[PDB]
mmCIF file of all heavy atoms in Angstrom:
data_model
loop_
_atom_site.group_PDB
_atom_site.id
_atom_site.type_symbol
_atom_site.label_atom_id
_atom_site.label_comp_id
_atom_site.label_asym_id
_atom_site.label_seq_id
_atom_site.Cartn_x
_atom_site.Cartn_y
_atom_site.Cartn_z
ATOM 1 N N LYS A 1 -24.866 -16.576 -13.441
ATOM 2 C CA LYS A 1 -25.991 -16.842 -14.358
ATOM 3 C C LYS A 1 -25.870 -16.361 -15.696
ATOM 4 O O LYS A 1 -26.174 -17.054 -16.615
ATOM 5 C CB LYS A 1 -27.298 -16.434 -13.711
ATOM 6 C CG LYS A 1 -27.710 -17.122 -12.433
ATOM 7 C CD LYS A 1 -29.221 -17.034 -12.305
ATOM 8 C CE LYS A 1 -29.644 -17.485 -10.948
ATOM 9 N NZ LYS A 1 -30.648 -16.633 -10.366
ATOM 10 N N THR A 2 -25.480 -15.081 -15.905
ATOM 11 C CA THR A 2 -25.317 -14.530 -17.168
ATOM 12 C C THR A 2 -24.038 -15.011 -17.950
ATOM 13 O O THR A 2 -24.068 -15.368 -19.128
ATOM 14 C CB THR A 2 -25.365 -13.075 -17.241
ATOM 15 O OG1 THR A 2 -24.377 -12.560 -16.415
ATOM 16 C CG2 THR A 2 -26.714 -12.489 -16.807
ATOM 17 N N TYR A 3 -22.916 -15.107 -17.274
ATOM 18 C CA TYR A 3 -21.709 -15.414 -17.827
ATOM 19 C C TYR A 3 -21.330 -16.982 -17.721
ATOM 20 O O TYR A 3 -20.274 -17.372 -18.052
ATOM 21 C CB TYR A 3 -20.502 -14.589 -17.363
ATOM 22 C CG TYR A 3 -20.520 -13.119 -17.792
ATOM 23 C CD1 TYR A 3 -20.511 -12.066 -16.888
ATOM 24 C CD2 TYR A 3 -20.788 -12.885 -19.111
ATOM 25 C CE1 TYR A 3 -20.554 -10.788 -17.424
ATOM 26 C CE2 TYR A 3 -20.791 -11.609 -19.639
ATOM 27 C CZ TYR A 3 -20.734 -10.562 -18.703
ATOM 28 O OH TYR A 3 -20.824 -9.241 -19.151
ATOM 29 N N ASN A 4 -22.354 -17.732 -17.147
ATOM 30 C CA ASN A 4 -22.221 -19.135 -17.090
ATOM 31 C C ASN A 4 -20.839 -19.483 -16.380
ATOM 32 O O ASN A 4 -20.244 -20.455 -16.695
ATOM 33 C CB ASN A 4 -22.312 -19.820 -18.361
ATOM 34 C CG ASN A 4 -22.727 -21.293 -18.268
ATOM 35 O OD1 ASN A 4 -21.981 -22.144 -18.516
ATOM 36 N ND2 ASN A 4 -23.992 -21.503 -17.901
ATOM 37 N N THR A 5 -20.470 -18.811 -15.439
ATOM 38 C CA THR A 5 -19.185 -18.937 -14.650
ATOM 39 C C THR A 5 -19.588 -19.246 -13.225
ATOM 40 O O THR A 5 -20.721 -19.261 -12.791
ATOM 41 C CB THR A 5 -18.336 -17.800 -14.642
ATOM 42 O OG1 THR A 5 -17.164 -18.014 -13.865
ATOM 43 C CG2 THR A 5 -19.007 -16.535 -14.314
ATOM 44 N N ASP A 6 -18.548 -19.493 -12.442
ATOM 45 C CA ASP A 6 -18.762 -19.850 -11.053
ATOM 46 C C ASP A 6 -17.786 -19.062 -10.139
ATOM 47 O O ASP A 6 -16.647 -19.570 -9.852
ATOM 48 C CB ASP A 6 -18.546 -21.354 -10.736
ATOM 49 C CG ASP A 6 -19.018 -21.806 -9.431
ATOM 50 O OD1 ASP A 6 -19.255 -20.977 -8.513
ATOM 51 O OD2 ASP A 6 -19.074 -23.047 -9.255
ATOM 52 N N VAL A 7 -18.162 -17.838 -9.716
ATOM 53 C CA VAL A 7 -17.307 -17.097 -8.850
ATOM 54 C C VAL A 7 -17.641 -17.432 -7.405
ATOM 55 O O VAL A 7 -18.837 -17.680 -7.090
ATOM 56 C CB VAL A 7 -17.579 -15.583 -9.158
ATOM 57 C CG1 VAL A 7 -16.643 -14.752 -8.287
ATOM 58 C CG2 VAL A 7 -17.392 -15.241 -10.599
ATOM 59 N N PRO A 8 -16.664 -17.417 -6.539
ATOM 60 C CA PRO A 8 -16.930 -17.605 -5.152
ATOM 61 C C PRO A 8 -17.084 -16.324 -4.328
ATOM 62 O O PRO A 8 -16.754 -15.216 -4.939
ATOM 63 C CB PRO A 8 -15.565 -18.288 -4.618
ATOM 64 C CG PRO A 8 -14.585 -17.684 -5.522
ATOM 65 C CD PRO A 8 -15.203 -17.541 -6.874
ATOM 66 N N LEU A 9 -17.734 -16.346 -3.181
ATOM 67 C CA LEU A 9 -17.869 -15.250 -2.233
ATOM 68 C C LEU A 9 -17.199 -15.652 -0.963
ATOM 69 O O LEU A 9 -17.598 -16.637 -0.362
ATOM 70 C CB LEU A 9 -19.357 -14.807 -2.143
ATOM 71 C CG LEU A 9 -19.646 -13.770 -1.018
ATOM 72 C CD1 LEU A 9 -18.817 -12.508 -1.376
ATOM 73 C CD2 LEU A 9 -21.112 -13.516 -0.884
ATOM 74 N N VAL A 10 -16.204 -14.883 -0.559
ATOM 75 C CA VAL A 10 -15.581 -15.165 0.790
ATOM 76 C C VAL A 10 -15.965 -14.004 1.698
ATOM 77 O O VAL A 10 -15.709 -12.800 1.357
ATOM 78 C CB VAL A 10 -14.072 -15.329 0.716
ATOM 79 C CG1 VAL A 10 -13.378 -15.637 1.946
ATOM 80 C CG2 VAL A 10 -13.762 -16.378 -0.321
ATOM 81 N N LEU A 11 -16.545 -14.273 2.901
ATOM 82 C CA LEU A 11 -16.838 -13.316 3.879
ATOM 83 C C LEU A 11 -15.959 -13.316 5.023
ATOM 84 O O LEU A 11 -15.788 -14.393 5.809
ATOM 85 C CB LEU A 11 -18.282 -13.635 4.397
ATOM 86 C CG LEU A 11 -19.395 -13.586 3.441
ATOM 87 C CD1 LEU A 11 -20.820 -13.561 4.111
ATOM 88 C CD2 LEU A 11 -19.367 -12.380 2.444
ATOM 89 N N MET A 12 -15.085 -12.292 5.185
ATOM 90 C CA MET A 12 -14.226 -12.249 6.286
ATOM 91 C C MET A 12 -14.954 -11.705 7.543
ATOM 92 O O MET A 12 -15.133 -10.500 7.731
ATOM 93 C CB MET A 12 -13.083 -11.353 6.080
ATOM 94 C CG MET A 12 -12.012 -11.149 7.269
ATOM 95 S SD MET A 12 -10.601 -10.109 6.804
ATOM 96 C CE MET A 12 -9.940 -9.829 8.393
ATOM 97 N N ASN A 13 -15.397 -12.688 8.338
ATOM 98 C CA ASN A 13 -16.093 -12.355 9.601
ATOM 99 C C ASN A 13 -15.237 -12.054 10.796
ATOM 100 O O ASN A 13 -14.026 -12.073 10.702
ATOM 101 C CB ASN A 13 -17.050 -13.518 9.951
ATOM 102 C CG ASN A 13 -18.142 -13.795 8.943
ATOM 103 O OD1 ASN A 13 -18.560 -12.871 8.266
ATOM 104 N ND2 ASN A 13 -18.651 -15.017 8.852
ATOM 105 N N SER A 14 -15.938 -11.665 11.851
ATOM 106 C CA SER A 14 -15.245 -11.359 13.200
ATOM 107 C C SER A 14 -15.897 -12.184 14.210
ATOM 108 O O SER A 14 -16.987 -12.776 13.984
ATOM 109 C CB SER A 14 -15.381 -9.865 13.476
ATOM 110 O OG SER A 14 -15.186 -9.627 14.783
ATOM 111 N N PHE A 15 -15.279 -12.227 15.338
ATOM 112 C CA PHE A 15 -15.974 -13.032 16.484
ATOM 113 C C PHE A 15 -17.251 -12.547 16.872
ATOM 114 O O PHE A 15 -18.114 -13.326 17.339
ATOM 115 C CB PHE A 15 -14.907 -13.160 17.691
ATOM 116 C CG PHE A 15 -14.674 -11.791 18.346
ATOM 117 C CD1 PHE A 15 -15.661 -11.030 19.010
ATOM 118 C CD2 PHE A 15 -13.376 -11.242 18.248
ATOM 119 C CE1 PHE A 15 -15.300 -9.772 19.548
ATOM 120 C CE2 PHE A 15 -13.115 -10.054 18.844
ATOM 121 C CZ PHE A 15 -14.065 -9.292 19.464
ATOM 122 N N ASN A 16 -17.528 -11.228 16.762
ATOM 123 C CA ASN A 16 -18.756 -10.548 16.943
ATOM 124 C C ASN A 16 -19.799 -10.940 15.870
ATOM 125 O O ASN A 16 -20.969 -10.850 16.092
ATOM 126 C CB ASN A 16 -18.644 -9.072 17.037
ATOM 127 C CG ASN A 16 -18.040 -8.476 18.139
ATOM 128 O OD1 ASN A 16 -17.046 -7.743 18.106
ATOM 129 N ND2 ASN A 16 -18.540 -8.818 19.372
ATOM 130 N N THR A 17 -19.306 -11.264 14.665
ATOM 131 C CA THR A 17 -20.248 -11.613 13.578
ATOM 132 C C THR A 17 -20.143 -13.004 13.027
ATOM 133 O O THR A 17 -21.118 -13.375 12.244
ATOM 134 C CB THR A 17 -19.976 -10.681 12.399
ATOM 135 O OG1 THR A 17 -18.638 -10.835 11.980
ATOM 136 C CG2 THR A 17 -20.181 -9.267 12.862
ATOM 137 N N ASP A 18 -19.174 -13.764 13.416
ATOM 138 C CA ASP A 18 -19.033 -15.115 12.816
ATOM 139 C C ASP A 18 -20.320 -15.836 12.837
ATOM 140 O O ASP A 18 -20.903 -16.256 11.895
ATOM 141 C CB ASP A 18 -17.845 -15.815 13.456
ATOM 142 C CG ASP A 18 -17.095 -16.676 12.413
ATOM 143 O OD1 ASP A 18 -17.803 -17.207 11.485
ATOM 144 O OD2 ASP A 18 -16.025 -16.947 12.597
ATOM 145 N N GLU A 19 -20.673 -16.138 14.115
ATOM 146 C CA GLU A 19 -21.799 -16.958 14.436
ATOM 147 C C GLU A 19 -23.098 -16.278 13.976
ATOM 148 O O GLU A 19 -23.874 -16.918 13.227
ATOM 149 C CB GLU A 19 -21.865 -17.297 15.960
ATOM 150 C CG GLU A 19 -20.723 -16.887 16.813
ATOM 151 C CD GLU A 19 -20.936 -17.223 18.280
ATOM 152 O OE1 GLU A 19 -21.814 -18.031 18.574
ATOM 153 O OE2 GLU A 19 -20.128 -16.743 19.192
ATOM 154 N N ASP A 20 -23.310 -15.063 14.294
ATOM 155 C CA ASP A 20 -24.605 -14.421 13.975
ATOM 156 C C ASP A 20 -24.864 -14.474 12.558
ATOM 157 O O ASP A 20 -25.924 -14.606 12.039
ATOM 158 C CB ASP A 20 -24.541 -12.941 14.488
ATOM 159 C CG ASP A 20 -25.457 -12.634 15.708
ATOM 160 O OD1 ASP A 20 -26.175 -13.482 16.098
ATOM 161 O OD2 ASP A 20 -25.277 -11.510 16.330
ATOM 162 N N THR A 21 -23.719 -14.382 11.800
ATOM 163 C CA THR A 21 -23.742 -14.427 10.340
ATOM 164 C C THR A 21 -23.959 -15.790 9.681
ATOM 165 O O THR A 21 -24.701 -15.940 8.789
ATOM 166 C CB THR A 21 -22.288 -13.950 9.733
ATOM 167 O OG1 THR A 21 -21.855 -12.774 10.425
ATOM 168 C CG2 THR A 21 -22.483 -13.621 8.233
ATOM 169 N N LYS A 22 -23.195 -16.890 10.264
ATOM 170 C CA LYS A 22 -23.417 -18.185 9.625
ATOM 171 C C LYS A 22 -24.816 -18.682 9.652
ATOM 172 O O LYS A 22 -25.275 -19.364 8.772
ATOM 173 C CB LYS A 22 -22.546 -19.235 10.301
ATOM 174 C CG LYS A 22 -21.099 -18.943 10.245
ATOM 175 C CD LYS A 22 -20.390 -20.299 10.390
ATOM 176 C CE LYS A 22 -18.908 -20.049 10.381
ATOM 177 N NZ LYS A 22 -18.408 -19.163 11.575
ATOM 178 N N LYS A 23 -25.579 -18.264 10.724
ATOM 179 C CA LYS A 23 -26.963 -18.698 10.900
ATOM 180 C C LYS A 23 -27.843 -18.464 9.594
ATOM 181 O O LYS A 23 -28.763 -19.218 9.267
ATOM 182 C CB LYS A 23 -27.612 -17.971 12.070
ATOM 183 C CG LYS A 23 -28.850 -18.745 12.546
ATOM 184 C CD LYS A 23 -29.171 -18.298 13.960
ATOM 185 C CE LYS A 23 -30.579 -18.903 14.368
ATOM 186 N NZ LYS A 23 -31.469 -17.782 14.819
ATOM 187 N N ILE A 24 -27.659 -17.276 8.966
ATOM 188 C CA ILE A 24 -28.472 -16.805 7.919
ATOM 189 C C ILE A 24 -28.000 -17.238 6.550
ATOM 190 O O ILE A 24 -28.645 -16.949 5.529
ATOM 191 C CB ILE A 24 -28.651 -15.332 7.875
ATOM 192 C CG1 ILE A 24 -27.333 -14.597 7.723
ATOM 193 C CG2 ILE A 24 -29.309 -14.897 9.262
ATOM 194 C CD1 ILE A 24 -26.902 -14.325 6.359
ATOM 195 N N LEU A 25 -26.789 -17.956 6.450
ATOM 196 C CA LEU A 25 -26.212 -18.242 5.148
ATOM 197 C C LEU A 25 -27.090 -19.387 4.358
ATOM 198 O O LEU A 25 -26.873 -19.610 3.191
ATOM 199 C CB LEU A 25 -24.884 -18.786 5.232
ATOM 200 C CG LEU A 25 -23.789 -17.696 5.370
ATOM 201 C CD1 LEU A 25 -22.455 -18.251 5.768
ATOM 202 C CD2 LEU A 25 -23.747 -16.900 4.087
ATOM 203 N N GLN A 26 -28.147 -19.900 5.125
ATOM 204 C CA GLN A 26 -28.947 -20.958 4.572
ATOM 205 C C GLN A 26 -29.820 -20.427 3.520
ATOM 206 O O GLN A 26 -30.217 -21.129 2.514
ATOM 207 C CB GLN A 26 -29.831 -21.560 5.724
ATOM 208 C CG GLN A 26 -29.039 -21.988 6.934
ATOM 209 C CD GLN A 26 -29.922 -22.469 8.045
ATOM 210 O OE1 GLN A 26 -31.108 -22.574 7.861
ATOM 211 N NE2 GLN A 26 -29.412 -22.782 9.226
ATOM 212 N N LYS A 27 -30.176 -19.136 3.482
ATOM 213 C CA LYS A 27 -31.092 -18.471 2.495
ATOM 214 C C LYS A 27 -30.563 -18.597 1.088
ATOM 215 O O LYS A 27 -31.357 -18.507 0.116
ATOM 216 C CB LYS A 27 -31.274 -17.087 2.909
ATOM 217 C CG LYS A 27 -32.104 -16.212 1.872
ATOM 218 C CD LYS A 27 -32.694 -15.057 2.397
ATOM 219 C CE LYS A 27 -31.652 -13.863 2.534
ATOM 220 N NZ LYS A 27 -32.201 -12.591 3.039
ATOM 221 N N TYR A 28 -29.224 -18.838 0.958
ATOM 222 C CA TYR A 28 -28.557 -18.725 -0.312
ATOM 223 C C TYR A 28 -28.136 -20.138 -0.811
ATOM 224 O O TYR A 28 -27.273 -20.305 -1.549
ATOM 225 C CB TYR A 28 -27.197 -17.904 -0.125
ATOM 226 C CG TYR A 28 -27.442 -16.523 0.477
ATOM 227 C CD1 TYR A 28 -26.651 -16.142 1.511
ATOM 228 C CD2 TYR A 28 -28.362 -15.668 -0.022
ATOM 229 C CE1 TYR A 28 -26.889 -15.010 2.226
ATOM 230 C CE2 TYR A 28 -28.532 -14.433 0.612
ATOM 231 C CZ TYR A 28 -27.788 -14.046 1.686
ATOM 232 O OH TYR A 28 -28.019 -12.803 2.247
ATOM 233 N N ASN A 29 -28.927 -21.078 -0.356
ATOM 234 C CA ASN A 29 -28.778 -22.443 -0.843
ATOM 235 C C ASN A 29 -29.143 -22.701 -2.267
ATOM 236 O O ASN A 29 -28.381 -23.272 -3.045
ATOM 237 C CB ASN A 29 -29.545 -23.539 0.017
ATOM 238 C CG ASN A 29 -28.866 -23.652 1.424
ATOM 239 O OD1 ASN A 29 -27.975 -22.865 1.889
ATOM 240 N ND2 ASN A 29 -29.316 -24.627 2.149
ATOM 241 N N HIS A 30 -30.275 -22.139 -2.667
ATOM 242 C CA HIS A 30 -30.698 -22.097 -4.087
ATOM 243 C C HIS A 30 -30.172 -21.063 -4.890
ATOM 244 O O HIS A 30 -30.176 -21.209 -6.157
ATOM 245 C CB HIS A 30 -32.238 -22.068 -4.020
ATOM 246 C CG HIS A 30 -32.973 -23.284 -3.574
ATOM 247 N ND1 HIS A 30 -33.144 -24.395 -4.374
ATOM 248 C CD2 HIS A 30 -33.597 -23.569 -2.368
ATOM 249 C CE1 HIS A 30 -33.713 -25.306 -3.636
ATOM 250 N NE2 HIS A 30 -34.003 -24.866 -2.457
ATOM 251 N N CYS A 31 -29.720 -19.991 -4.350
ATOM 252 C CA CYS A 31 -29.002 -18.910 -5.131
ATOM 253 C C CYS A 31 -27.649 -19.409 -5.530
ATOM 254 O O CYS A 31 -26.984 -20.148 -4.778
ATOM 255 C CB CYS A 31 -28.991 -17.631 -4.329
ATOM 256 S SG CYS A 31 -30.375 -16.453 -4.697
ATOM 257 N N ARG A 32 -27.358 -19.021 -6.791
ATOM 258 C CA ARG A 32 -26.154 -19.743 -7.515
ATOM 259 C C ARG A 32 -24.770 -19.234 -7.276
ATOM 260 O O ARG A 32 -24.072 -18.908 -8.144
ATOM 261 C CB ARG A 32 -26.554 -19.500 -8.997
ATOM 262 C CG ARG A 32 -25.842 -20.466 -9.959
ATOM 263 C CD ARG A 32 -26.797 -20.987 -11.014
ATOM 264 N NE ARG A 32 -26.423 -21.017 -12.401
ATOM 265 C CZ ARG A 32 -27.107 -21.196 -13.460
ATOM 266 N NH1 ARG A 32 -28.468 -21.260 -13.400
ATOM 267 N NH2 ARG A 32 -26.598 -21.131 -14.649
ATOM 268 N N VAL A 33 -24.400 -19.357 -5.945
ATOM 269 C CA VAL A 33 -22.988 -18.869 -5.547
ATOM 270 C C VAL A 33 -22.448 -19.649 -4.399
ATOM 271 O O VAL A 33 -23.149 -19.997 -3.534
ATOM 272 C CB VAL A 33 -23.067 -17.440 -5.085
ATOM 273 C CG1 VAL A 33 -23.939 -17.213 -3.939
ATOM 274 C CG2 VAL A 33 -21.695 -16.934 -4.825
ATOM 275 N N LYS A 34 -21.170 -19.826 -4.456
ATOM 276 C CA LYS A 34 -20.422 -20.563 -3.404
ATOM 277 C C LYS A 34 -19.906 -19.630 -2.311
ATOM 278 O O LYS A 34 -18.813 -19.027 -2.483
ATOM 279 C CB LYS A 34 -19.286 -21.352 -4.038
ATOM 280 C CG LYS A 34 -19.011 -22.768 -3.448
ATOM 281 C CD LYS A 34 -18.209 -23.625 -4.270
ATOM 282 C CE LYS A 34 -18.959 -24.116 -5.501
ATOM 283 N NZ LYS A 34 -18.255 -25.212 -6.273
ATOM 284 N N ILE A 35 -20.621 -19.514 -1.170
ATOM 285 C CA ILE A 35 -20.261 -18.660 -0.116
ATOM 286 C C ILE A 35 -19.282 -19.336 0.896
ATOM 287 O O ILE A 35 -19.681 -20.443 1.358
ATOM 288 C CB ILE A 35 -21.446 -18.135 0.671
ATOM 289 C CG1 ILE A 35 -22.454 -17.435 -0.398
ATOM 290 C CG2 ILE A 35 -21.085 -17.060 1.640
ATOM 291 C CD1 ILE A 35 -23.730 -16.994 0.140
ATOM 292 N N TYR A 36 -18.200 -18.818 1.082
ATOM 293 C CA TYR A 36 -17.314 -19.286 2.100
ATOM 294 C C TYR A 36 -17.241 -18.261 3.255
ATOM 295 O O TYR A 36 -17.982 -17.310 3.319
ATOM 296 C CB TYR A 36 -15.808 -19.492 1.453
ATOM 297 C CG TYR A 36 -15.733 -20.373 0.438
ATOM 298 C CD1 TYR A 36 -16.455 -20.243 -0.803
ATOM 299 C CD2 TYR A 36 -14.779 -21.430 0.456
ATOM 300 C CE1 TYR A 36 -16.315 -21.139 -1.843
ATOM 301 C CE2 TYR A 36 -14.658 -22.350 -0.573
ATOM 302 C CZ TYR A 36 -15.383 -22.199 -1.715
ATOM 303 O OH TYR A 36 -15.301 -23.096 -2.737
ATOM 304 N N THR A 37 -16.269 -18.479 4.179
ATOM 305 C CA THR A 37 -16.247 -17.786 5.404
ATOM 306 C C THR A 37 -14.894 -18.021 6.144
ATOM 307 O O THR A 37 -14.428 -19.142 6.091
ATOM 308 C CB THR A 37 -17.320 -18.209 6.515
ATOM 309 O OG1 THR A 37 -18.601 -17.761 5.960
ATOM 310 C CG2 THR A 37 -17.179 -17.480 7.807
ATOM 311 N N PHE A 38 -14.300 -17.032 6.726
ATOM 312 C CA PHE A 38 -13.065 -17.235 7.540
ATOM 313 C C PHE A 38 -13.012 -16.107 8.575
ATOM 314 O O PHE A 38 -13.111 -14.937 8.288
ATOM 315 C CB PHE A 38 -11.872 -17.298 6.736
ATOM 316 C CG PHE A 38 -11.473 -16.046 6.140
ATOM 317 C CD1 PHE A 38 -10.214 -15.445 6.475
ATOM 318 C CD2 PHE A 38 -12.162 -15.453 5.118
ATOM 319 C CE1 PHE A 38 -9.829 -14.261 5.988
ATOM 320 C CE2 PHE A 38 -11.806 -14.223 4.619
ATOM 321 C CZ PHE A 38 -10.647 -13.693 5.034
ATOM 322 N N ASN A 39 -12.900 -16.549 9.817
ATOM 323 C CA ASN A 39 -12.781 -15.601 11.026
ATOM 324 C C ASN A 39 -11.513 -14.757 11.038
ATOM 325 O O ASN A 39 -10.415 -15.394 10.960
ATOM 326 C CB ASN A 39 -13.081 -16.286 12.305
ATOM 327 C CG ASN A 39 -13.524 -15.433 13.430
ATOM 328 O OD1 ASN A 39 -13.257 -14.190 13.331
ATOM 329 N ND2 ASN A 39 -14.267 -15.998 14.355
ATOM 330 N N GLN A 40 -11.642 -13.554 11.359
ATOM 331 C CA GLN A 40 -10.538 -12.669 11.552
ATOM 332 C C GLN A 40 -9.930 -12.977 12.873
ATOM 333 O O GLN A 40 -10.549 -13.643 13.675
ATOM 334 C CB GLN A 40 -11.003 -11.209 11.398
ATOM 335 C CG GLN A 40 -9.867 -10.198 11.736
ATOM 336 C CD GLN A 40 -10.476 -8.770 11.840
ATOM 337 O OE1 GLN A 40 -11.719 -8.591 11.525
ATOM 338 N NE2 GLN A 40 -9.704 -7.890 12.298
ATOM 339 N N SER A 41 -8.734 -12.553 13.158
ATOM 340 C CA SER A 41 -8.035 -12.820 14.365
ATOM 341 C C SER A 41 -8.789 -12.142 15.669
ATOM 342 O O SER A 41 -9.767 -11.520 15.490
ATOM 343 C CB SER A 41 -6.623 -12.344 14.409
ATOM 344 O OG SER A 41 -5.827 -13.180 13.506
ATOM 345 N N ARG A 42 -8.279 -12.463 16.749
ATOM 346 C CA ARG A 42 -8.837 -11.913 18.026
ATOM 347 C C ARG A 42 -7.747 -11.599 18.976
ATOM 348 O O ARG A 42 -7.181 -12.486 19.670
ATOM 349 C CB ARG A 42 -9.853 -12.801 18.668
ATOM 350 C CG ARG A 42 -10.576 -12.197 19.758
ATOM 351 C CD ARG A 42 -11.711 -13.087 20.230
ATOM 352 N NE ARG A 42 -11.181 -14.009 21.180
ATOM 353 C CZ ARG A 42 -11.530 -14.159 22.517
ATOM 354 N NH1 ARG A 42 -12.677 -13.543 22.927
ATOM 355 N NH2 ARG A 42 -11.062 -15.039 23.279
#
């Protein structure tokens, strides 16, 4: 918002957190950032 740029956020989740985490990512729909996700190995 201040630097008028578009930085991404990548969350390296785990099988214990992948799902539990994706559920709440909805809160950040209006907040000005591109949140990604990728699961760690198992």
Side-chain angles (χ1 to χ4, degrees):
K1 291 201 189 139
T2 56
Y3 289 130
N4 203 249
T5 174
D6 190 350
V7 184
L9 170 59
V10 182
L11 301 191
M12 179 178 166
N13 293 333
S14 159
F15 61 69
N16 288 125
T17 61
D18 211 333
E19 353 181 11
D20 253 348
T21 318
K22 297 203 182 68
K23 199 164 174 235
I24 60 90
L25 278 171
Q26 308 176 7
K27 174 163 75 176
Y28 311 124
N29 289 14
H30 286 283
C31 263
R32 200 135 136 193
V33 65
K34 215 165 285 191
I35 305 174
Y36 299 60
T37 293
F38 71 113
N39 201 334
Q40 180 187 350
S41 292
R42 187 174 88 125

